[PDB]
Design a protein around this ligand. Structure first.
Ligand SMILES: O=C1CCCC2=C1C1(CCCCC1)N=C(Nc1nc3ccccc3o1)N2
Ligand SMILES: OC[C@H]1O[C@@H](O)[C@H](O)[C@@H](O)[C@H]1O
Length: 391
């Protein structure tokens, strides 16, 4: 009774009803974009490294219709959203551009509109709904950026590439939400495919769809239901730190630096700096092994490289928190768990447990009985990325 089911048919239905009530007519378009769990490859994306996320059945839906008057009218229904629930604004122009501000959920939609590369973009009316827990570490902000972007393509098709769309979504996260994120979360929300993880190369931007078929394997996501102060504050600090271990070692990114190099480079950088790399330069060179291991269906090893990812996130990158540590170390003692680790940016949010489906009922008994805080669970199929339904 801690498991939240996806309920995606009723999420779309909720959004259409709220649209008819709010705007006096039936919406003409539905889009969705998923949130994400990163299986392995944490704090690598901005280090031009490798990540292995998948898309969730947890998503953000826009339902809307173009307007003739050049203005945008938004209703959000998400419980967590900061007041007001509605905002309206003219389209940006050469003269006036959109500005971040109040309410914050709107900043994401504004950013994407502001950086949208095709024209002419008409005004629109839209309802925004999401089953992605807001600020819970499964990329609610990326689902809303990419859901926005997918709605704008229907209003005014772009003639570009999946990376250009991810950079636009990423720029809205930088400029309008003041969060200097990598490309992972936008990329997986765009490109996820049911029954697949997505191995992303954040240097080359090559991507591989890795079958996650086997119905033996389950991915249990557990929300800690915490977010520490340190989150919003330490993420850019870590990023900046990485950029100095890279600058010091005459490497254009840590992708280029290998562990044998960092170990014999100790003197050129700081104890906590060098330790940030043992994680990053290390991390890269085990998502690769996790990738090569999921293909072999090996599981143990992804696991080892996984718990090795948490331990490294906890001790070297210092971006876990006692709640995440107690959840990982808790699951990691249940036989049949290959691995568990913090996922996403850390300082709170979710862990990800690679278990055997048979044991799912007992784990959710156990974790809720053996976790100090409030556990929410998702038993997540690997899902589709951005989608359109004409209405
Ligand atoms: O306060 C923070 C701290 C940083 C993390 C972050 C938030 C808030 C910002 C706006 C109010 C709720 C919390 N929202 C998101 N993501 C988000 N996804 C959404 C999908 C549909 C509607 C609204 C959505 O807000 N991320
Ligand atoms: O795995 C670490 C990740 O933290 C995310 O939440 C951020 O949006 C990503 O770009 C990546 O930096």
């Amino acid at each position: 009774a801690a498991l939240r089911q996806p309920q995606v048919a009723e999420l779309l239905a909720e959004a259409r009803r709220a649209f008819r009530e709010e705007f006096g007519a039936e919406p003409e378009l539905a889009v969705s974009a998923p949130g994400r769990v990163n299986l392995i490859g944490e704090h690598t994306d901005y280090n031009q490294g490798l990540v292995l996320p998948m898309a969730l059945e947890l998503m953000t839906v826009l339902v809307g219709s173009p307007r003739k008057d050049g203005l945008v009218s938004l209703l959000t229904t998400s419980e967590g959203a900061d007041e007001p629930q509605r905002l309206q604004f003219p389209l940006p122009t050469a003269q006036r551009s959109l500005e971040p501000g109040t309410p914050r959920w709107a900043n994401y939609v504004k950013g994407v509109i502001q950086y949208y590369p095709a024209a002419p973009l008409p005004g629109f009316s839209a309802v925004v709904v999401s089953s992605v827990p807001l600020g819970g570490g499964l990329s609610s902000s990326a689902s809303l950026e990419v859901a926005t972007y997918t709605f704008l393509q229907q209003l005014c098709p772009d003639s570009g590439t999946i990376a250009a769309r991810a950079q636009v979504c990423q720029q809205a996260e930088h400029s309008f939400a003041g969060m200097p994120c990598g490309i992972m979360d936008q990329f997986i929300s765009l490109m996820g495919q049911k029954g697949h993880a997505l191995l992303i190369d954040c240097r080359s931007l090559e991507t591989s769809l890795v079958p996650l078929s086997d119905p033996k394997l389950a991915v249990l996501i557990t929300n800690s239901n915490v977010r520490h102060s340190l989150a919003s504050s330490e993420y850019p600090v870590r990023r900046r730190q990485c950029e100095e271990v890279a600058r010091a070692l005459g490497a254009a990114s840590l992708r280029e630096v290998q562990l044998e190099e960092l170990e014999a480079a100790r003197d050129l950088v700081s104890k906590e700096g060098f330790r940030r790399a043992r994680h990053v330069v290390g991390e890269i060179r085990r998502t690769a092994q996790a990738a090569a291991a999921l293909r072999r269906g090996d599981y143990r090893a992804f696991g080892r490289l996984m718990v090795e990812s948490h331990r490294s996130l906890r001790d070297d990158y210092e971006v876990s928190c006692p709640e995440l540590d107690q959840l990982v170390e808790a699951a990691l003692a249940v036989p049949g768990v290959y691995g568990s680790r913090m996922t996403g940016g850390g300082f709170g949010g979710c862990t990800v447990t690679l278990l055997e489906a048979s044991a799912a009922p007992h784990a959710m008994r156990h974790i809720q009985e053996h976790y100090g805080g409030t556990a929410t669970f998702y038993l997540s199929q690997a899902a589709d990325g951005a989608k359109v339904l004409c209405l």
